[PDB]
């Protein structure tokens, strides 16, 4: 399959080749999150939602697994690792809780709303959901494994945070020898438009590839 | 010890602490070099090179160990990985290569000229040297091993490019649990001047902290 991509088109096999959805929880997507009351712009998320929704369909369609990302720990953080950790302190979900007691617990908490995928987006049988505890997917998870196992070498990235979680994944993806691809529109940022724009130039420049949902789409109907 | 940092400040002591001087070659700093002939600019790094000279000869005094990083391969770039790996794909010097055959052997290969740290920077007895073939510091080489080894939990980051090796290598710190520490004009962006900015505001935000040469020095003087 060939799909045309910045900086140039590329070729993928969809059967050995993954769509990641990358923590599309209430935390990095809805209103009253996490990302939210810690002070990010979530308020124009109902667009990447959809465009994930339409890319999981036509990956599943062509035989690409399905892999969701859901980050956070467990409530007690013990996850989140202690004092110790420099997780412990760079944390903005642990950085509002410290702040604002009230919602000790609950940000990224596994079992929680927080934690919940967003309504719309509801994986599949088939579908692998993984628990990661740090930004970066292929860190302290069976991601790799999961992969390897398959003979999958190419990613396909969507989710939240374009410069956070995803590019995390897709640059340690590229250091485990993975071609990743990031379908822009299909991604948001934590932080001002620029981290959206210097994500996508990051890994359309040294990393990966850049892409979009309909690009995407269409070179899989065949 | 503390240093002054955003997005506020931390505790650190430079015994258990290394400063690393990531990529300072000719290829990275020098116009002449990869970087420039690639077509980014390098007219810049004059004052970085100074300002890692400044916080070298601190670290030192302080006794923190310094790791040089130098990026690149063998000449026949059989370790930049062949078409199985992306990095033969998405490495601009081996597209410049590629492009510019005049060039082939010439950019980032041991024993070039391009691939020498620049004549300013010239590593000392008790410094660690270490070559690396991919632009994070922690994949594919003993990085990790030898800060556990000595018992280093603060890495201090300087050199070219912000926004890649620099922010990768940090990055990957991180998720290995060193807090990361980034002198802002002790590096140098590959990119357009928002690659400067973003990588800070990524790292400040979400990875570790950002802080500054002259700052470094006078929490390094007692």
Known sequence: ?????????????????????????????????????????????????????????????????????????????????????????????????????????????????????????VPQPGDIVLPKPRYSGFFNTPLDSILRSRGIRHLVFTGIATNVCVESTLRDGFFLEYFGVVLEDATHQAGPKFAQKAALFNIETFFGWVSDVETFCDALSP
Chains 1, 2 share one sequence.
């Open 1 to 121: 399959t060939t799909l045309t991509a910045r900086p140039e088109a590329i070729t993928f096999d969809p059967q050995q080749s993954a769509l990641i959805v990358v923590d599309m929880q209430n935390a990095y997507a809805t209103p009253g999150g996490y990302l939210d009351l810690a002070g990010f712009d979530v308020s124009t998320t109902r667009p990447v939602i959809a465009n994930i929704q339409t890319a999981v369909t036509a990956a599943r369609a062509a035989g690409m697994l399905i892999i969701w990302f859901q980050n956070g720990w467990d409530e007690q953080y013990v996850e989140a690792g202690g004092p110790g950790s420099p997780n412990f302190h760079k944390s903005n979900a642990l950085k509002t809780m410290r702040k604002q007691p009230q919602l000790q617990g609950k940000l990224l908490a596994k079992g929680s709303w927080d934690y919940q995928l967003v309504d719309e987006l």
